[PDB]
Design a protein around this nucleic acid. Sequence first.
RNA 1: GUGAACAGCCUCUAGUUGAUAGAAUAAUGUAGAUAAGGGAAGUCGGCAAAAUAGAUCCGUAACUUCGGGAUAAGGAUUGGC
RNA 2: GCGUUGGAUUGUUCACCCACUAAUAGGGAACGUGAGCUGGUAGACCGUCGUGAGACAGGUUAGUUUUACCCUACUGAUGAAUGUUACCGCAAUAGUAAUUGAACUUAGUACGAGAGGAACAGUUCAUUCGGAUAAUUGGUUUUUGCGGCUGUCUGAUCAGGCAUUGCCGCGAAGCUACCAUCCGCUGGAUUAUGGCUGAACGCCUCUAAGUCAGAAUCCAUGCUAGAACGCGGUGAUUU
RNA 3: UGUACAACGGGGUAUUGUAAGCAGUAGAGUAGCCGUUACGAUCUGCUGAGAUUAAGCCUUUGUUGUCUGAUUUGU
Lengths: 93, 134, 148, 130, 77, 386
Amino acid sequence: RDIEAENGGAGVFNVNLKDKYLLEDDEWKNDIMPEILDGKNVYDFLDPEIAAKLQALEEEEEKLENEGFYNIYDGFEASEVDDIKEKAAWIRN
Amino acid sequence: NGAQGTKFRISLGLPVGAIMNCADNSGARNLYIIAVKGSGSRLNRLPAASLGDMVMATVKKGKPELRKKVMPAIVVRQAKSWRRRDGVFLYFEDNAGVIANPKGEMKGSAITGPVGKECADLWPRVASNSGVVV
Amino acid sequence: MRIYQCHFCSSPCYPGHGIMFVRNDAKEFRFCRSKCHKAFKQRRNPRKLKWTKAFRKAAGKELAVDSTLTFAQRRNVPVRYNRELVATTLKAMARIEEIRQKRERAFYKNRMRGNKEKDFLRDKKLVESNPELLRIREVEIARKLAKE
Amino acid sequence: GRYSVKRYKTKRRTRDLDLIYNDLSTKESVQKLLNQPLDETKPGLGQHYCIHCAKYMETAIALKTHLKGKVHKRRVKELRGVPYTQEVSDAAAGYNLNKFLNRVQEITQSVGPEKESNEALLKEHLDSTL
Amino acid sequence: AKSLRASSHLNAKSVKRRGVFQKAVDAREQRISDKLKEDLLKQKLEDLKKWRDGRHHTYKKAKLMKQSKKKTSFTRF
Amino acid sequence: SHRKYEAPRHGHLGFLPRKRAASIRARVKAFPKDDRSKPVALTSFLGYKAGMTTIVRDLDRPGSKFHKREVVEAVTVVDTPPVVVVGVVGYVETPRGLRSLTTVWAEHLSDEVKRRFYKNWYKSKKKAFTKYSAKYAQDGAGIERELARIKKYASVVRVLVHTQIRKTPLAQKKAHLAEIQLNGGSISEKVDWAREHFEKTVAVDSVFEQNEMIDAIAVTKGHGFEGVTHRWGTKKLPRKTHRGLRKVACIGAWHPAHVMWSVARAGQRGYHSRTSINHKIYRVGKGDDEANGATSFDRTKKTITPMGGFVHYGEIKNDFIMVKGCIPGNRKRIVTLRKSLYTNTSRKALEEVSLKWIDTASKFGKGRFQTPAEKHAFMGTLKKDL
RNA sequence: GUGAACAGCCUCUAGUUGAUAGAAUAAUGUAGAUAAGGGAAGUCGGCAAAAUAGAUCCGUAACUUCGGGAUAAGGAUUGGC
RNA sequence: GCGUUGGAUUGUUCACCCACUAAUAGGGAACGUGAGCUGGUAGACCGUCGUGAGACAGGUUAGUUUUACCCUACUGAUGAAUGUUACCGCAAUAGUAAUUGAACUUAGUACGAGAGGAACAGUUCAUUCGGAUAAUUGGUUUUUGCGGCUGUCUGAUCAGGCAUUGCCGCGAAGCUACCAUCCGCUGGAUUAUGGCUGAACGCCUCUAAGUCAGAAUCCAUGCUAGAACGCGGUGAUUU
RNA sequence: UGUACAACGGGGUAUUGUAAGCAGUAGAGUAGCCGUUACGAUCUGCUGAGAUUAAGCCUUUGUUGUCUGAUUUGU
Ligand SMILES: [Zn+2]
Ligand SMILES: [Zn+2]
């Protein structure tokens, strides 16, 4: 009430909803949390244990990269195949 | 007066001569009659309002003890396309009605179905009698 | 601010976009546009319409289950706001999107392999079908090369 | 245009198959709606109420002719599978996958055959009384 | 109600203006002048990367003489 | 007789005559009053209107019911590339009005302003300011004499500037020219400022900044010959009335002998010159720095220009001003931004607006994606890719 | 050919392609059509418009000159293979 | 200066009834013969009268005037001639617009036995009106854009034609809605009234000479047009 | 006679809703042949495919072509 009286009256005084909050570090009082990134929302991806699940994800991806995951017909050599292809394209046109 | 807060603007859906639903078990089924409080005065224009707006009404269907009797109360659902000042347009399944005294206090004691966010914020006893907001 | 998903198209519904409908069960149905809204009104089945994501995921198009798709869980129990944790999440999201996009491209490759064999067999049947046009092709090529 | 505008108004809005699924799920829900005490306002005075097609008929024979029809079979063939909730709509987009999959396996294990047996009891009850 | 041109409301506004609003209005002027001067200095830095006696006399005397022959002059008769 | 039922007028008699404006570029009819205590400052700026868009804001408005709550709002975007100074005018006081007694131009000028002076540019020899450039010889006796004339007399000083239409995607090739007043003090210092500023540019950051209430003066979107009902707002007669129903039936019972200037007839609707005041700037964005459309809350690198560009306009490759709401004029026009003519005693002109998000979706339809990367990621790989 | 049908819609034979033309697409009109939510608050007056409409089945009140009322009313359906 | 409503009632209304509202004030420019648009002669029936034809103390019902293309006024739109052409401007004159209610706080204070219960200053939003606008929502579809449906015709498939835009669904762009959004001010002189000094009239007196405040009023700032016979400054001036 | 102008095309954006053609055994059953073949609304796959995309959308290192006709004006 009196801090209001000091700064400015009821309809002018902008209270900081912060300054009451309880944190590990106090120097970060005037920070902001990002809400939206490219398409996603931060609140959905934000867990305390995300770096470990990301480590597991990277382990899995590196296993697949070593595996065969990211990787002519007999009778016709290659130019025969191209000849057949161009003849068929000509026929359709 | 009776309401807590300012005259805020949300689109109009309910002109005079509109029968809307009551789902509480005070006894009524329907609400019709004329009047809207805080309505303007313009030639040829209908009194029509919402925003948890208070209106005069009669029971067209219900118990005879409260038929034939004019009464005030408040819109809680509209079914027109209203805009929230926080993003999206809202609209309900239907119109809904329900009953009170001029101070905003209800004749009934509980509400069925959803009630509008701004209607409950404007009328306290609706928020106490409502179990379902939005 | 939030980014909701259309009840029909499973598409993002940004602020100031779309319409919301509030059923009597106190349940919200928000749509990306009047197309999906009107389909809902007409009581169409989005699992039968080919331009949704539900049809795709149910049919076996672009994949439904993966480790990449578990991170966007909704969270009803919050945390103390560590900005270090925020910064880690910001990089994590970008990395996860690359990984998911690569796996999606791989799924599409797995689906669309076996098409060039079919196309080649089509062309083989056609050319072995229709030789009488190949004579017109031969004579016209010869005429042109003798012309030039 | 006029057909869609004047059929699918929110005034003339019907009862959202999700809820019909949740109603045909359990015993007490189906028995309540089969009992349905005498209401002066309802078309059939309560009784003769189809739950799949959430509709009050006048009489038992009007129920018979409704059940011997493609309008009933449309709904029963629509209501066999899962009901397409927002859970499905967001799991498609990559959002609350595990909730959707738990719901799916829950229906596949528990709720599915529950509702199927309830429907079969409903059908032989109606065919026996009618 | 009290109109826009009501003396009391205008006096209240007059009392408010000299205070919290004119300070905010005057700070912006100093800020924008400080920006205006730098937008000159940067242009200079980029540059350093490399009677009225002619015709007014005749035209005016001719106009005055046309005016004095046609008698179409405002001051002269 | 006494009409039996009072009702307000239909239309405003101050916005008359409802005729076509005499110029596409509306003319500024009043600049703020000068205070000779304060630094030298431009009173106005020029810009080109480029569509509209939508933003979300975090509102610290005490007393309101969105205090500490989020609010979606429309905004207008004006392409405001830097403005070039080319001249000075001095306006002496008289007991008839204000009179211009001399105008001084710069040494070198651009093909744009020369095109403005010309009307068939592709045939001319382009001989516009040759003798003036010659008058800019060794000492510039004439130039200095007229400048000293302006310092001595003339009372108030305006500056002739032009735009850099070359920078916009607009297909016009011809710049606009405008007098913009200098509102600092010391006429000598005004003239010195202009003398030093010839052939040099003034950006919009050097005339405006955030949280400022500005006025837009423009011309409003001609629709053509229109009738009573849509041009004044009258009722419609019920149906199949005689000689039609989209008009005023009559004047009543009583008998005049003339038709008045007050009885709401047909004619031109639009292309009127309008002055709409008190629009709050939300962003002064710059082309040099990408991520204009991004925000402290978003951190999603993108410029304000939506996917597929604006409609009937291109991309914003230049400095821009974002204001809230609806200004007069349509896209691809010339608007003048003036600053407010009076100190505003509303807290609206004090609140430091903070944005959370800007909509960069397509306006060529129902836009669902802010970026083509988002579109790519959602749609997934197509047939054409691989 | 559809269909109960010399109805309405398309076509074969035979006949015609005649009625001052061209360019734009302002208002007001003439002839039509659609419209959120509310649904007769309009107006002297529901004028006009809308809605209903074919065929199969169920079912059908008062009154009655016993012949009717009656397609009373009110309800379930209609494709393709 | 600004506003002064929505409806019920035709066995009728030279009016009344209940509601909303800040309020629901009265009148004129027609009715000082007769003048927008809309309700309130010919045929027929009942009643009174009449020998009768018919009339009426009545009552009921049905029942074709059709400008403006002329002058003026009004609204918008061009335009000759004042060395030519072009650009930037001034502002005489004319018009002018904003309005009302509620809410926080002041304060459960002043005031009051109690019951009850204000206001200035500081703030927020809405009603009526006006002017713009199209980011979003909704509407609109000859984009005849996409798809589908009935009947028929082109031998079937494909691709199409016809059904006075054939019908159904979605439908961008454009237009558009307090059905969407935005915006809408500040100086001087005054009325009533309250006063200062002060005679008339050896007291006294707001007044007689002088003089301070003061109303949504007046005049201006601001907004709109710009005198086509009002004006200025400025650029080029013909192989 | 130029980062000139236009007609085409390319890219992006948006609207619609998965083209023509070919194949399968997925297909209520019916016939023939000693389980198998023919018919078969429809379903599945190549296929968010195919079509349209300025006429008052954005963009363009492409191809092709075009750029001195008429009249009038003096302080
Ligand atoms: Zn959708
Ligand atoms: Zn059913």
